[PDB]
């Protein structure tokens, strides 16, 4: 048995945009889900080739927008809580149920050592070159954490990890 990730799509999201945002092959999407080439079925759980099952992952990331913090829960038990930075785009999602699609290791630039690609380019998590910008709200930036925090997270959590971006209010 090969337990893979399952993403739920809606009606309006362009297939090309989905493949691009997910950084995956468009052909692979049609490979796992041959119905996509015909039409976008809203409410259907599509299979993402290369992504593991998000329930098998014994790590739950509970993001709190109003508290600007990331609650890392191991086996449904809170293990650590680190301060994070969120943008106006993060306040949009009330539930924010997203999964990690891939993780970039050492981009060379001021990305913060590591880059965690989520199911949305503006809802992704990464470090930074200025830790003073962490813990507060930013204009239109993505989820930012400390250099050590993202390193710790990338070591504890794998791929497909369920990040729940809750506003808290």
């Amino acid at each position: 048995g090969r337990k893979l990730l399952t993403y739920q799509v809606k009606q309006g999201d362009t297939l090309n945009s989905i493949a691009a945002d997910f950084r995956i092959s468009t052909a692979a999407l049609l490979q796992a889900n041959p119905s996509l080439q015909a039409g976008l079925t809203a409410g259907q759980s599509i299979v993402i080739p290369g992504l593991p099952d998000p329930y098998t992952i014994p790590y739950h990331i509970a993001v709190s927008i109003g508290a600007k913090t990331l609650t890392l829960s191991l086996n449904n038990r809170v293990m650590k809580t680190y301060p994070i930075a969120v943008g106006k785009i993060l306040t949009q999602t009330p539930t924010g149920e997203f999964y990690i699609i891939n993780r970039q290791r050492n981009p060379g630039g001021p990305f913060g050592a590591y880059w965690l690609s989520l199911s949305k380019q503006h809802y992704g998590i990464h470090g930074t070159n200025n830790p003073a910008s962490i813990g507060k709200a930013v204009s239109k930036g993505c989820i930012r954490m400390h250099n050590k925090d993202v390193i710790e997270l990338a070591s504890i959590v794998p791929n497909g990890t369920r990040v729940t971006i809750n506003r808290g209010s």
Partner: peptide, 4 residues
């Protein structure tokens, strides 16, 4: 959306 986007990225960094």
């Amino acid at each position: 959306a986007x990225k960094x």
